[PDB]
From Swiss-Prot:
The keyword Ribosomal protein applies. Signal peptide: none annotated. Coiled coil: none annotated. This is Small ribosomal subunit protein uS11. The keyword Transcription does not apply. Belongs to the universal ribosomal protein uS11 family. Located on the platform of the 30S subunit, it bridges several disparate RNA helices of the 16S rRNA. Forms part of the Shine-Dalgarno cleft in the 70S ribosome. Keywords: Ribonucleoprotein, Ribosomal protein, RNA-binding, rRNA-binding. One of its GO terms (biological process) is translation.
Length: 118
RNA sequence: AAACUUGAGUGCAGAAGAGGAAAGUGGAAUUCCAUGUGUAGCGGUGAAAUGCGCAGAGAUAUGGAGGAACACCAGUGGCGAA
């Protein structure tokens, strides 16, 4: 009931409303997930870099418990906590081979929602 | 009534163009469906709540369905009577 991997990819989704972190193998398999809402932060605070740092630290701790050593960063969303999440990943002992922002670029398909009037 | 080539067209040699009409091909992305991993949140806001989710949501990986628009080029740029 244990997983042993040495190289992997950490997916970090940071939106202005919340931060979610997970780590997977090189073939995208899920071990554990972390979110600011689960950590305890509610409402606005979930977007703060500190909550992102805590979630990234928890996710990296579980990844290294399963045995991860080298990880590649997969960043999603425009939130401000992406850099804090990456630094927490680095400080957890894992080695960042490279960083890539996989934020989906819609070329021209689909109509975005109405601009807010507030 | 009779001449002219300057206006207006024509011939000859060249130029660019999101001008229009009809078929075909394509990548990104959104939604949905199925399945594997996985746990208690997701989403949202000034802050919240409705709502969705312990029947397994959200995240993640793969495949499928389908509609719609064409990121970069792109520019006091081009084309058209509008």
């Amino acid at each position: 009931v244990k997983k042993n991997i040495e190289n992997g990819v950490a997916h970090i989704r940071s939106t202005f409303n919340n931060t979610i972190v997970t780590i997977t193998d090189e073939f995208g398999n899920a071990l554990s997930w972390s979110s600011a809402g689960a950590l305890g932060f509610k409402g606005s605070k979930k977007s703060t870099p500190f909550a992102a740092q805590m979630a990234s630290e928890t996710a990296s701790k579980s990844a290294m418990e399963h045995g991860l050593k080298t990880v590649e960063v997969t960043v999603k969303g425009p939130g401000p906590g992406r850099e804090s999440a990456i630094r927490a990943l680095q400080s957890a002992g894992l080695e960042v081979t490279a960083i890539r922002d996989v934020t989906p670029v819609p070329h021209n398909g689909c109509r975005p929602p109405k601009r807010r009037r507030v």
